[PDB]
Every structure is written in C-alpha cells, then in structure tokens.
C-alpha cells in the first residue's frame, strides 16, 4: 500500500472528460470511489493497449485523451501518489 485506504475509499466526481473516459469502458454513474476510478482507468489502458512489453510498468498515453487529461506522454504504474495527483487534477 502506497495510498491510505481511507483516501482510496473516498467518493469523487469526475470532471466531464474523465467521465467520458470512464463511460467509454462501461462505467454508468457520475460519482465513484477513487479505487473505482482507478479500476476503470486500468480497463481503459488495457483496452487501448497503452502499454509495451519492453517497459512493462509504463503506461504510454501520448496522442490519447488519457495523456491530455494527465498532462504527460507516459507514466509509471508504480508511482501511486503521482497517479492520484494526476486524477485529482481531473475531479470536480
Ligand atoms: C501493463 C501495465 C502498464 O503494467 C499496467 C496497466 C494497467 F492498466 C494497470 C496496471 C499495470 C496496474 O497495476 N493497474 C492497477 C493500479 C495501478 C496503480 C494504481 C494507483 N495509484 C492503481 N491501480 C492498472 O489497472 C489494472 C486493471 C484494473 O485494476 C486490470 C485493468 C492501472 C489502473 C489505473 C492506472 Cl491510472 C494505471 C494502471
């Protein structure tokens, strides 16, 4: 665990383009726990194949709405506080 359980559990409201992303992989609500947002972001990453076998912990999100939302061309799945901060930029 890198992120406290209580923080993972908290209900959040995605801004519209993050909601678009979540809805494109089957999410059907306006509010989610951060853990739920992360689950659907993972579904999106795996669906769009934003990964590479040579660097298995890197999400390659350039030229993708996810990259626009997070403001980076790539990031490491191991850096959870950095991921949370990128999500917070996208919550109401
Ligand atoms: C192959 C690759 C690049 O290594 C990869 C891709 C991937 F999509 C996931 C992982 C790894 C991984 O470990 N995940 C779980 C995770 C990672 C970090 C945090 C935080 N803070 C929370 N959860 C991901 O989702 C996994 C899954 C849903 O749980 C089945 C679809 C995931 C979710 C969301 C984000 Cl933003 C980033 C990553």
Curated annotation (Swiss-Prot):
Top-level taxon: Eukaryota
Protein name: E3 ubiquitin-protein ligase Mdm2
Domain SWIB/MDM2: 10-92
Entire-sequence positions represented here: 17 to 108 of 491
Function statement: E3 ubiquitin-protein ligase that mediates ubiquitination of p53/TP53, leading to its degradation by the proteasome. Inhibits p53/TP53- and p73/TP73-mediated cell cycle arrest and apoptosis by binding its transcriptional activation domain. Also acts as a ubiquitin ligase E3 toward itself and ARRB1. Permits the nuclear export of p53/TP53. Promotes proteasome-dependent ubiquitin-independent degradation of retinoblastoma RB1 protein. Inhibits DAXX-mediated apoptosis by inducing its ubiquitination and degradation. Component of the TRIM28/KAP1-MDM2-p53/TP53 complex involved in stabilizing p53/TP53.
Subunit and partners: Interacts with p53/TP53, TP73/p73, RBL5 and RP11. Binds specifically to RNA. Can interact with RB1, E1A-associated protein EP300 and the E2F1 transcription factor. Forms a ternary complex with p53/TP53 and WWOX. Interacts with CDKN2AIP, RFWD3, USP7, PYHIN1, and RBBP6. Interacts with ARRB1 and ARRB2. Interacts with PSMA3. Found in a trimeric complex with MDM2, MDM4 and USP2. Interacts with USP2 (via N-terminus and C-terminus). Interacts with MDM4. Part of a complex with MDM2, DAXX, RASSF1 and USP7. Part of a complex with DAXX, MDM2 and USP7. Interacts directly with DAXX and USP7. (Microbial infection) Interacts with herpes virus 8 protein v-IRF4.
Disorder noted: Seems to be amplified in certain tumors (including soft tissue sarcomas, osteosarcomas and gliomas). A higher frequency of splice variants lacking p53 binding domain sequences was found in late-stage and high-grade ovarian and bladder carcinomas. Four of the splice variants show loss of p53 binding.
PTM summary: Phosphorylated at multiple sites near the RING domain by ATM upon DNA damage; this promotes its ubiquitination and degradation, preventing p53/TP53 degradation. Autoubiquitination leads to proteasomal degradation; resulting in p53/TP53 activation it may be regulated by SFN. Also ubiquitinated by TRIM13. ATM-phosphorylated MDM2 is ubiquitinated by the SCF(FBXO31) complex in response to genotoxic stress, promoting its degradation and p53/TP53-mediated DNA damage response. Deubiquitinated by USP2 leads to its accumulation and increases deubiquitination and degradation of p53/TP53. Deubiquitinated by USP7 leading to its stabilization.
Signal peptide boundaries: none
Region (Sufficient to promote the mitochondrial pathway of apoptosis): 1-85
UniProt tissue specificity: Ubiquitous. Isoform Mdm2-A, isoform Mdm2-B, isoform Mdm2-C, isoform Mdm2-D, isoform Mdm2-E, isoform Mdm2-F and isoform Mdm2-G are observed in a range of cancers but absent in normal tissues.
Cell compartments where the protein resides: Nucleus, Nucleoplasm; Cytoplasm; Nucleus, Nucleolus; Nucleus
Notes on the domains: Region I is sufficient for binding p53 and inhibiting its G1 arrest and apoptosis functions. It also binds p73 and E2F1. Region II contains most of a central acidic region required for interaction with ribosomal protein L5 and a putative C4-type zinc finger. The RING finger domain which coordinates two molecules of zinc interacts specifically with RNA whether or not zinc is present and mediates the heterooligomerization with MDM4. It is also essential for its ubiquitin ligase E3 activity toward p53 and itself.
Disulfide bonds, paired cysteine numbers: none
Recorded name of the encoding gene: MDM2
Annotated segments matching region Necessary for interaction with USP2: 1-92
Reported induction: By DNA damage.
Assigned protein family: Belongs to the MDM2/MDM4 family.
Organism, as annotated: Homo sapiens
Additional facts recorded: MDM2 RING finger mutations that failed to ubiquitinate p53 in vitro did not target p53 for degradation when expressed in cells.
């Amino acid at each position: 665990s890198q992120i406290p359980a209580s923080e993972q559990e908290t209900l959040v409201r995605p801004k519209p383009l993050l909601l678009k992303l979540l809805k494109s992989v089957g999410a059907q609500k306006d509010t989610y726990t951060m853990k739920e947002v992360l689950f659907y972001l993972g579904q999106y990453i795996m669906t769009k194949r934003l990964y590479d076998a040579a660097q298995q912990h890197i999400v390659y999100c350039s030229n993708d709405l996810l990259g626009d939302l997070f403001g980076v061309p790539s990031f490491s799945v191991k850096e959870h506080r950095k991921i949370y901060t990128m999500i917070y930029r996208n919550l109401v």
